[PDB]
């Protein structure tokens, strides 16, 4: 591990407190992508979900992922929200 | 210092369409970098005369 | 710095300078022949021959510069196919065959190829061609391969995912790409997306 | 420094 | 209307008939109009094989006629003294006009003026080309371009008017563009003209950063002399009165930021406006909301200006902007250097959020490699996407490998031939080879390098090296030996931070003596080792093999490269005796700069300097005396020789195989071989303690325009060096060389520049306590060494 | 490395009189190779000449020995705007925007004027007012009495100019002033107010092509000079182009009876009909030798070149009358015919008196 120097490696989707606070369930895409912007990742197998994954490791340990899941159905409404604003 | 009869290409990786599982599909493919099966009885490789041809 | 001459003798000239496989020479003859009478009854033959010669000679930047010219001015041409065959080896030996650096070659290669056997599956070259497709569809898979490689180093495991994710899109019958897979799990591993992880787990325990 | 620099290798 | 039967061609030369068909909108057997016709002659032009087109109504045949543009048959020159034809022909294919193409013939005084531009760049504004084309029998130009270029412009005045509290000259002294050079002399810029932006950036710097937050440059006029040999320019400007700053009131889009830009702009009141601490502000603020997500934050600041008082009330405009994502990185022209190579210095991650930044900071961190000529950046919103962005990085490939050599003329080394070959990108894979060889008074070194620079992504390099050196001990102002060592290191860099970084790594060394003139100190080295050769002769040989852990630290907060004003540089270098080795000894140097400017203009800053040394043996053996410490010259104490502080040769007596002819010897038999003759030669120690403090000034007596150029310093010098195994005792007689009391301490002036030779450093010190047998050497100097 | 044009070599002239130095007086280090207008100027029988670092001398006309000796630095004081008297005073524009007013008596300053930018304009001085064009537009008019900046009329200026800033001629109370456009501008006298303003020159491309960075008015009509632009003869009124001719110079030619005695760009001498401006003859052996402005001496026409070689023209022919190396410092800075003396400074201060 050491003392290297890491340079800070962000990944993925943006997600404020005052954002993921606004999605309410029932909701178009076009609505939700307007709500938080696109995700970075979207499942290609077969299942409109949408991950925003908002992973945060600056230099050194203390890294930092909150992964909010938007599954959809085959219509194009959200039908489930989840989200977890750590990893343990 | 560049290629002037080469043959390495012929020994590159073929191309075997991947088994999809049961409740779970493969991402769409892009029609982009798709290939023709061309019956093809022409040469490959060192074989085949690239010189151009003529007429009369 | 050819002298006038009559044409038929730089032309037996240029045309024995060629199967003598000295194309420096026989460029000299037909670079110089083409600006003398860069129209004539018989004056697209010199036009192949400076194109072939230009190639052999690894004069890439001309024979690129000649074809597409030739092509502008004689889409119609029944030779056509041939020009095209010769575009396609151009970019492609502009590229590596430990193959990832700038791919504008092989995908520029990869289309003039595709050209050829969308309009003319019949020609002489079309199957020299495909086996050519098959070496740059697995090159330019190899390349996004390269970049999801580096992606899973710094950690950046969206990129990791996406780049995988697009391989599957692009080049998913490719080699390049059945060995990228295990890349895409580790990503969605690392990012605890266990969830998705086993989905492409049982795409690799599908296949080879 | 001193004389010169050829870059071309 | 018009129905068309055929079509028909008349002026077809290169064209196929094919290949003006597939360009005609109106087909065979197409009804058409006057305005269909007007349509296709319209489209057959946007082809650009025409000179001119007329499609014409001939019954039931509609007829196009055509007059092809000629064919480019040749392209000679003839007058281009200062552009090679090759540089030219290269940039006409680039712009269209090439061998084998037709002639835009509109566009041949376009081609023309197009190169004049080129040579007013440079500052031939006499310059002009023509351009002779000449028709030959079959449709064919043969294009001429007669060029004469002339004498190129020189700028014979720099001007400033309204400047009341700077001298036209202070403020000239900063500027890229010189009213005058000198020589016989300065290497200070040229004397030429272009892009003058950007040194009107710095006369506002010069001006905003001392508190003239009305300051106004109201116009820049550039003359010409009618010759056009000649060339003027004047700034005018206004200059405010000196304002206060107020304090700081932040308004706009903060994103609910408030909290942390309220103290960002917190200023203490009193202090005088200071255009670059707006400037940090601005950019602490684009750093703040770069950090939450935001790619492109706006901030302006316009000084509400209060003459009653004299303060300023900064008016900061904050606006976070939107937030884009990264879905590719990608690099254009990298067609030598693997993809990893350009991906390694991105501060951009790609698949997550746009840094307006972290895209520049990556161009920055790819250029600085050197191995591309250019380096573009292009971020392009991704189709079909509100928020995604693709980052393009266009580079053109730079020839990375060079031949390199150097003179330089130092007084404690001579002449220095620095020569070698380079290879700064290993077909391309950031992998530098190389083969150094310099080549001094005392030494003949030459290495082999192979070094990666990220051995891990994070920064870590692996460089091995591969050496031989030759010392010859006589020329290096020491007694007489000859060391002949080669071996091999593996290193390990590792970057910590922007100023700090570690070396680590393991050493091979054969040490190869010879040719050891016998004195005391060199001789209990020798006893310790278990080697006892003969005390009265020339003729001896020690073959050494070493194995050593190498380890150092440098820090580097120096404001600037060249004449630091502010900031310490700290190296430390380490080694020690893997057990193994022939010797067993540690080794550890350390030097110090300290930087401590006194004025605000930093024109007075006061440097202080410390070296310190100190090795000895282990298992009873001792220091190596080729490892030992010396202190003399222009990199240490100046005013003394090179190399002539510390311990002296106790010689015994010998005969070499010189043949005593009618030379000064030290202890020879031919002379009278008593016992033991102390000398003046030096030896050096196992432990060293120099520490200097220079005070640099302003240059009082050279113009204003370029003193700054030169810089001169009062040195205060002090040394010591010292043997620890020193027998005090048993040479009862013979001065006692363990005690580092005996401060040599010297005082001189310095005075350094760069002239054409290179850069150069005169010292000239007279040494005021000296000690027994030192050799003083008053005036020092190099010609950059390298 | 080379130079586009031969400066066309010394005419070997047989000379038809003896071009003499009646005196001689050197003024401290001179304009040197910074391109002024910095001229002597002679009023009553006195001389009145300075250098660029700020050294001004006043001598007698006929031994051309000093009389007072003052000079206006500390640091240099960059005189350029050539040395101009009326009233009582001495007028000199200095490059660091300042305007010195000195007594023709013992030489103290009278006034300075802190002027709009460089004052490289040959102070003109009209009504009761002198006029300073500066090297930023700026045609300021200071008060003769006391310097008092009495009004500023903002000429704009181009992207790249020349240098010489155009002296104004006046006329009814009117100012005709040159422009660095091409533009010739008439101004009040009284407020500086725009009358009209005619553009003179010929724009060529997308290149840089400048227009004249001095006028003259008989009979109602205007006649000035463009750079490239054109010899042009303008309704004094209305300043509409009468008559346009396609030669161009920076050096201010003479209107004498009905000819125009004009140095081109070219250096080459011509004499033209004032009336439709159809030419003369043409003098094209001093190509390219960097002619000064020309004058009228006893019926001839004296120029001088960058080697200090006077010249004498015959006004009727073309021909050339006489030839001298009076100063091989070089020459530029205009001559003066006034009094029956013709006096030049070359580059270097000093001042010739040539008679015979």
Known sequence: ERVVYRPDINQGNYLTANDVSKIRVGMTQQQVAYALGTPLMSDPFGTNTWFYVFRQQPGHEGVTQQTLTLTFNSSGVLTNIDNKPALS | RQVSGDEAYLEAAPLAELHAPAGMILPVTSGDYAIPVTNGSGAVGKALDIRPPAQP | ?208 | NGMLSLGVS | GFVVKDIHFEGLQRVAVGAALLSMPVRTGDTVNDEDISNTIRALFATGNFEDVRVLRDGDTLLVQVKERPTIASITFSGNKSVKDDMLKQNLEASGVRVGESLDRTTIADIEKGLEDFYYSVGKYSASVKAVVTPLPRNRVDLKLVFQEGVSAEIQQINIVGNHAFTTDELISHFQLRDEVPWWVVGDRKYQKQKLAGDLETLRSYYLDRGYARFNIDSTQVSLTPDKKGIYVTVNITEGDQYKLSGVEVSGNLAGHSAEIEQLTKIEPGELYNGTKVTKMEDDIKKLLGRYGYAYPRVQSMPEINDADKTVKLRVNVDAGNRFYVRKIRFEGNDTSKDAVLRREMRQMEGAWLGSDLVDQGKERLNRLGFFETVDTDTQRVPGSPDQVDVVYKVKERNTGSFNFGIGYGTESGVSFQAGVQQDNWLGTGYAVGINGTKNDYQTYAELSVTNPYFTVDGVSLGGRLFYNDFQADDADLSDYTNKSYGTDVTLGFPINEYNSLRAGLGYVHNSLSNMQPQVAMWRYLYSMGEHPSTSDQDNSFKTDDFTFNYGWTYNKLDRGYFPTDGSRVNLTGKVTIPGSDNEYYKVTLDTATYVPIDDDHKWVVLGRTRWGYGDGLGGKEMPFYENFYAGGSSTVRGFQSNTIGPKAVYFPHQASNYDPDYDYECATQDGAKDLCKSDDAVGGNAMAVASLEFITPTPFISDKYANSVRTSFFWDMGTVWDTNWDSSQYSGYPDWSDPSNIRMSAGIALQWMSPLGPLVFSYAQPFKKYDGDKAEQFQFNIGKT | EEDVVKMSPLPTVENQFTPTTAWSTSVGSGIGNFYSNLHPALADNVVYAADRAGLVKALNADDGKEIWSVSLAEEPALLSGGVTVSGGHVYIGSEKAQVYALNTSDGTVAWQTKVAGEALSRPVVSDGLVLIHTSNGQLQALNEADGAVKWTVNLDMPSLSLRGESAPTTAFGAAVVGGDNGRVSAVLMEQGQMIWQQRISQATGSTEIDRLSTPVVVNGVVFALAYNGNLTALDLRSGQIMWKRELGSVNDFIVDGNRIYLVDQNDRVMALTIDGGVTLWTQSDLLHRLLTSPVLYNGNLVVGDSEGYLHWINVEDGRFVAQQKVDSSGFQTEPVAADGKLLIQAKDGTVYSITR
Do not use: C
């Open chain 3, 1 to 208: 710095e050819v002298p006038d001459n009559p044409p038929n003798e730089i032309y037996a000239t240029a045309q024995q300078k060629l199967q003598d496989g000295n194309w420096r020479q026989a460029i000299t003859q037909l670079e110089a022949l083409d600006n003398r009478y860069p129209f004539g009854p018989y004056s697209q033959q010199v036009q192949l021959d400076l194109i072939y010669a230009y190639y052999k000679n690894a004069d890439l930047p001309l024979a690129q510069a000649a074809i597409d010219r030739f092509i502008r001015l004689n889409p119609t041409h029944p030779n056509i196919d041939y020009v095209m065959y010769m575009r396609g080896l151009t970019n492609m030996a502009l590229d590596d065959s430990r193959s990832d650096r700038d791919p504008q070659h092989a995908r520029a290669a990869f289309s003039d190829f595709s050209k050829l056997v969308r309009g003319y599956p019949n020609s002489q070259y079309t199957t020299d061609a495909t086996k050519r497709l098959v070496f740059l569809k697995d090159r330019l898979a190899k390349y996004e391969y390269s970049v999801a490689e580096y992606y899973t180093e710094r950690g950046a495991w969206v990129a990791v995912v996406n780049r995988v994710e697009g391989m599957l899109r692009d080049y998913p019958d490719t080699q390049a790409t059945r060995d990228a897979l295990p890349l895409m799990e580790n990503a969605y591993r690392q990012m605890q997306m266990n969830a998705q992880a086993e989905k492409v787990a049982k795409i690799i325990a599908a296949n080879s």
